[PDB]
Symmetry: C2
Subunit: 49 residues, 2 copies
Amino acid sequence: RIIFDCSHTMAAQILKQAMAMGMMTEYYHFIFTTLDLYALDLEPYRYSG
Amino acid sequence: RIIFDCSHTMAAQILKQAMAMGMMTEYYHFIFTTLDLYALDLEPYRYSG
């Protein structure tokens, strides 16, 4: 159970970090607070479930 | 514990599909069967451990 305050481009970078590290998963109940990341593209992170 | 009869480029394909689907973890203990298994892209799945 993790919560995320951070800029959205850095957040997409940490998406790349975490899905490379295998952490971008349905295992862990997350909550982002990003509202502007929709400009960037999220699709394998969204299809990671 | 799954064993993987597939080509090397097909292995890279399904690796891209699988880390897009978020199913890359140390929990999974696998065996790939392809003779070319050092000659392509190889990195982020090892950092999913």
